[PDB]
Amino acid sequence: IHVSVVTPDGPVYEDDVEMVSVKAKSGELGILPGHIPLVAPLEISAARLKKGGKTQYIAVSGGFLEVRPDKVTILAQAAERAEDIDVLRAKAAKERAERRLQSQQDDIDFKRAELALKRAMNRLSVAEM
Amino acid sequence: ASLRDIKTRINATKKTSQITKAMEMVSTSKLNRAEQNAKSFVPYMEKIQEVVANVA
Amino acid sequence: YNHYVSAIQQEVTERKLLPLTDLAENKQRTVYEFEPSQEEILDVLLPQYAESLIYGA
Predict the structure, then answer these.
(1) The dihedral of CA C44, C45, C47, C52: what is its sign?
(2) Cβ contact (<8 Å) for B56 and C46?
């Protein structure tokens, strides 16, 4: 039935699939349309789902599953599509360099603008009139 | 005061005004981007909130 | 933190993060089966809720 995975950064995947299988911390689970309302946390694992025309590849980190007979959703703090947990950690590590570079650039732009403003104000002040 | 001093002060004030206007434009663009980022967070927050509400 | 009301108005806001003394009960009010025990689900769910609140702030 309808499935969707979302993250605090935003939605990731959205489609209607009649078979989804996930690994919960207490054991394996499998969901089909008309399933009873069930809540279970998910550890670091794939989100193997079948009937999307072909076996679709979704992997999540810090997952949390909530199921409705007509709606399926899982909440993940991080998600990717290669299903290789090494790829997930690789992406997480690679994002750190981008974050540092972005923070440094944001700081330097403001510093340059502030220097320009300081010089202009100093010129205005020394022109006391 | 002297005419030249007043002219110099006017030029300096014009420069400061230009710098402040540029800063304002940059801040406006960043505010728009921040609003988009904030609105991108709603679907996760509402869902987790309702799940916590009906479970706890 | 400062709460964004408008371009002119920003309001300083004091929020009690946790313990969750009160919850805004939703309008639907369903019940789910728990594959773990209820506590074994809450002890994982609640910290995520707190982190989400911090991120929204």
Answers:
(1) positive
(2) yes
* Residue A34, domain extent: 2-85
Q: Are strands A10-16 and A20-24 parallel, antiparallel or unpaired?
A: unpaired
Put simply, whether B49 touches C (Cβ < 8 Å) is yes
Chain C positions in Cβ-Cβ contact with residue B56 (cut-off 8 Å):
20, 23, 42, 46
Q: Which residues pair with A126 in a beta bridge?
A: none
Which neighbouring-strand residues pair with A56? A49
Q: Which tokens belong to A57?
A: 């590849």
Cα–chain center distance at B21: 12
Of A76, C56, C1, residue with least CA distance to B40: C56
Experimentally determined by: cryo-EM
Data resolution in angstroms: 2.6
User: Would you list which residues of A are annotated within the binding site for ATP?
Assistant: 80, 86, 89, 96, 112, 119, 123
Interchain CB contact of A87 with B (< 8 Å): no
Among B9, B24, B43, C40, CA closest to A25: C40
Look at residues C21, C17, C15, C25 and name the one whose alpha carbon lies nearest to residue C52.
Answer: C17
CATH number of residue A28's parent domain: 2.60.15.10
The residues pairing with A11 across neighbouring beta strands, listed in sequence order, are A6
In angstroms, the CA C45 to CA C35 distance is: 14
B49 and C49 within 8 Å at the Cβ level: the answer is: yes
Q: Cis link prior to C19 (omega < 30° from 0)? A: yes
